[PDB]
Curated annotation (Swiss-Prot):
SUPFAM superfamilies: UBC-like (SSF54495). Changing N84Q: Impairs catalytic activity. The modification N-acetylserine is found at S1. Changing V24A: Impairs binding to RANBP2. This is SUMO-conjugating enzyme UBC9. Forms a complex with SENP6 and UBE2I in response to UV irradiation. Forms a tight complex with RANGAP1 and RANBP2. Identified in a complex with SUMO2 and UBE2I, where one ZNF451 interacts with one UBE2I and two SUMO2 chains, one bound to the UBE2I active site and the other to another region of the same UBE2I molecule. Interacts with SETX. Interacts with HIPK1 and HIPK2. Interacts with PPM1J. Interacts with RASD2. Interacts with TCF3. Interacts with NR2C1; the interaction promotes its sumoylation. Interacts with SIAH1. Interacts with PARP. (Microbial infection) Interacts with human herpesvirus 6 IE2. Pfam families: UQ_con. It comes from Homo sapiens (Human).
Amino acid sequence: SGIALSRLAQERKAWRKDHPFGFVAVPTKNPDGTMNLMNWECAIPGKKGTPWEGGLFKLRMLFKDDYPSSPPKCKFEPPLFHPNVYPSGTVELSILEEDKDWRPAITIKQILLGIQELLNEPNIQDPAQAEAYTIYCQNRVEYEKRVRAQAKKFAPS
């Protein structure tokens, strides 16, 4: 885990120095209050001018011991209504796949901005959940209606 922790400490430094407005990315605590750099609690704000606007969408970023060989698993908690989000909460995205567009050099900032962009522009060619995907494909106005409601439920206080 040395190589992974070295990189994850450099990502925490870069993120604290400068990150996009409204985004959260913080390592979790181990039982003994020590920092767990392999498991981050993140939040993505809905984009201004979209049906996601107003919402803050919490997500866990989970790193394997061979990071950055492998991308993190990115998991919305709770699971999101979105065509490219598995019922588990796992995000399906090409930059989050080792055998697709993942590159070791991709930053936490680039991952979170990538997921933000996915939220309002689903990929109709890599479905992840039957429920959201079918409504997206067959009934776009009802899809956008469910998204507006979701954005209201996850409005921050």
